[PDB]
Amino acid sequence: QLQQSGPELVKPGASVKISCKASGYSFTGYYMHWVKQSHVKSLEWIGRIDPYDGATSYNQNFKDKASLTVDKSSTTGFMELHSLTSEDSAVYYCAREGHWDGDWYFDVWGAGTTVTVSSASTKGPSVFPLAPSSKSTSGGTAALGCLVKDYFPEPVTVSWNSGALTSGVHTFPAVLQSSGLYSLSSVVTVPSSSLGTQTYICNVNHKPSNTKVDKKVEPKS
Amino acid sequence: GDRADGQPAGD
Amino acid sequence: DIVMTQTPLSLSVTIGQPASISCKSSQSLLHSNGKTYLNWLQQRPGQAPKILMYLVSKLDPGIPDRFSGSGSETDFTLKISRVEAEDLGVYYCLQGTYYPFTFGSGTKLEIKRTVAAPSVFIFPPSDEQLKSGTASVVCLLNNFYPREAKVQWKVDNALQSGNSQESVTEQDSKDSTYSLSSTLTLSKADYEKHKVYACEVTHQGLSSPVTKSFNRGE
């Protein structure tokens, strides 16, 4: 697979270098390409690098904007984006051009790095339980969750029971508050019969500010 | 020959 | 650069029915070497794009065979013989014949399923948040279809405006439903001025509005 670096806040005019660690295949055997996904969901190819010799080929629109390097000894590829403006806020993917039955196409993608260009400062969220009660029961099931309030920028990562509880989770799109800060909730539906034995913990990781919160969500007593 | 190849629009 | 134009730009297909998406390229994608470098990708909500088909018609080996592609040198069609819940998302064509690689704009596929009414839940503010001076009340509408729903907040049976925000999930890749939350935010002072907090939910799967409420401090 391919493992990209976490999300980035970047001041306008500044630069940032994002990375893409390759594992499980021969690094210098395949091109590593980089793709920008703008918030309107348009995809554009940025360029590619030959990890064997460091040779780069760039989309002409990103010539002054991106530079591709590679570190053989750490089988990791890097894209540096220069002199950033509002138009460079987006999700950046790396992808391996692989081969199958004698043809070439993009066959492994990293998960994306969100870059937000802003002069505002990063700010970690406050996390509050949404406790289950008689007002959040239906059909013998209970809903519960966490309110993740007042952070900047996107994205914040929410998981439940350290990744073990995924079925029935809904982590909603963030809303933009009048303050210019974001909030979201993440909820899960569970058996109501098991609220006395199971433990439900929402894990919140807001990497831009290096903020991590675990909140155990319990019934009100 | 162990060297990367890919679709012609990459260069 | 080569222009890739997709049509339609969105469509909504009932589970089990066929779907068809086309792409036109502004020039022949037939390379000198006899190959036609036209690819199709799917991007599900929350995921990276994924190659479905390359060389117009060749299926990636992990792709189910209800997908097929056809085409000439300039016009191409991706067909799903019978859509399933996991086919949701945005579909892109991509040409690799001429530098630079270029994508189309994307066609968003929604999966139509049977009408499902929301299950509605309401959450008072936590004591933790109250201590800090604000009260968020959350109303949750879970697993409904189609996505249009109306939420109204009533406080001591007076309709509220201007003090709430909502957002709706992407479509679910397993059951094809949506969920929505609506959050009412007051100061702690204004919260403590009132007794009954209610959200009233309208949805075409409901024959009258559904109300979930609590009394402050129970």
Task: Give one DSSP letter per residue of A47-70, joined into a string.
Answer: EEEETTTTEEEE-GGGTTTEEEEE
Look at residues A129, A132, A152 and name the one whose alpha carbon lies nearest to residue A142: A132
Question: What is the rounded distance in angstroms from the CA atom of residue B8 to the CA atom of residue A215?
Answer: 51
How far, CA to CA in Å, does A182 sit from each of A39, A172, A177, A179, C151? 16, 12, 6, 8, 21
Question: What is the rounded distance in angstroms from the CA atom of residue C94 to the CA atom of residue C104?
Answer: 6
Q: Which residue of A has its CA nearest to C108?
A: A41
Q: Which of B3, B7, B11 sits opposite A52 (nearest CB)?
A: B3
Is the peptide bond preceding residue C146 cis, with omega within 30 degrees of 0? yes
Question: What is the rounded distance in angstroms from the CA atom of residue B2 to the CA atom of residue C178?
Answer: 47
DSSP A152: B
Asked if residue C106 and residue C125 are part of one domain, the reply reads: no
What domains, with CATH codes, occur in chain A?
2-117 (2.60.40.10), 128-216 (2.60.40.10)
Are C48 and A109 within 8 A, CB to CB? yes
Asked if residue C108 and residue C9 are part of one domain, the reply reads: yes
Asked if residue C105 and residue C123 are part of one domain, the reply reads: no
Are A31 and B7 within 8 A, CB to CB? no
Under 8 Å CB-to-CB from C181, ≥6 apart: which residues?
A: A172, A185, A187, C138, C139, C140, C141, C166, C167
A155-174 residues touching B, CB cutoff 8 A: none
Asked if residue C42 and residue C27 are part of one domain, the reply reads: yes
Looking at the structure of chain C, the number of domains it has is 2
Q: Which residue of C has its CA nearest to A112?
A: C48
Asked if residue C161 and residue C82 are part of one domain, the reply reads: no
| A contacts of B6 (beta carbons < 8 Å) | 30-31, 48, 97, 104
Look at residues C87, C112, C137 and tell me which one is the last residue of a structural domain: C112
Asked if residue C61 and residue C45 are part of one domain, the reply reads: yes
Question: What is the rounded distance in angstroms from the CA atom of residue C99 to the CA atom of residue B10?
Answer: 6
A76-81 vs C164-168, strand pairing mode: unpaired
Are A201 and A217 within 8 A, CB to CB? yes
B11/A48 touch (CB, cutoff 8 Å), yes or no: yes
Asked if residue C75 and residue C126 are part of one domain, the reply reads: no
Q: Which of A128, A170, A173 sits opposite C128 (nearest CB)?
A: A128
DSSP C130: H
Question: What is the rounded distance in angstroms from the CA atom of residue A183 to the CA atom of residue C136?
Answer: 11
Question: Which residues span the domain enclosing C133?
Answer: 119-215
Q: Length of chain B in residues, anyone?
A: 11
Look at residues A16, A17, A9 and name the one whose alpha carbon lies nearest to residue A207: A9
The stretches of A156-213 forming alpha helices (DSSP H) are none
Q: Could you give the angle at the alpha carbon of C200 between the alpha carbons of C195 and C201, nearest 5°?
A: 155
A-C CB pairs within 8 A amount to 125
CATH of the domain at C57: 2.60.40.10
C118: amino acid identity, one letter? P
Question: What is the rounded distance in angstroms from the CA atom of residue C104 to the CA atom of residue C112?
Answer: 24
Asked if residue C88 and residue C50 are part of one domain, the reply reads: yes
Look at residues C63, C95, C112 and tell me which one is the last residue of a structural domain: C112
Are A77 and A39 within 8 A, CB to CB? no
Q: How far is CA C179 from the centre of its chain?
A: 10
Which of the other chains make 3 or more beta carbon contacts under 8 angstroms with chain B?
Answer: A, C
Question: What is the rounded distance in angstroms from the CA atom of residue A12 to the CA atom of residue B2?
Answer: 41
Asked if residue C10 and residue C106 are part of one domain, the reply reads: yes
Which of the other chains make 3 or more beta carbon contacts under 8 angstroms with chain A?
Answer: B, C
A97/B4 touch (CB, cutoff 8 Å), yes or no: yes
Judge whether C55 is closer than 8 Å to chain A, CB to CB.
yes
Question: What is the rounded distance in angstroms from the CA atom of residue A203 to the CA atom of residue A148?
Answer: 10
Are A201 and A214 within 8 A, CB to CB? yes
Resolution (A): 2.0
Question: What is the rounded distance in angstroms from the CA atom of residue A55 to the CA atom of residue C132?
Answer: 55
Asked if residue C123 and residue C106 are part of one domain, the reply reads: no
Asked if residue C131 and residue C99 are part of one domain, the reply reads: no
Question: What is the rounded distance in angstroms from the CA atom of residue C177 to the CA atom of residue C114?
Answer: 9
DSSP of C58-78: EEPTTS-TTEEEEE-SSEEEE
Look at residues C109, C134, C119 and name the one whose alpha carbon lies nearest to residue C180: C119
DSSP A156: -
Asked if residue C90 and residue C70 are part of one domain, the reply reads: yes
| Burial class, C216, CB count within 10 angstroms (exposed 0-12 / middle 13-18 / buried 19+) | middle
Judge whether B11 is closer than 8 Å to chain C, CB to CB.
yes
Look at residues C88, C112, C136 and tell me which one is the last residue of a structural domain: C112
Judge whether A187 is closer than 8 Å to chain C, CB to CB.
yes
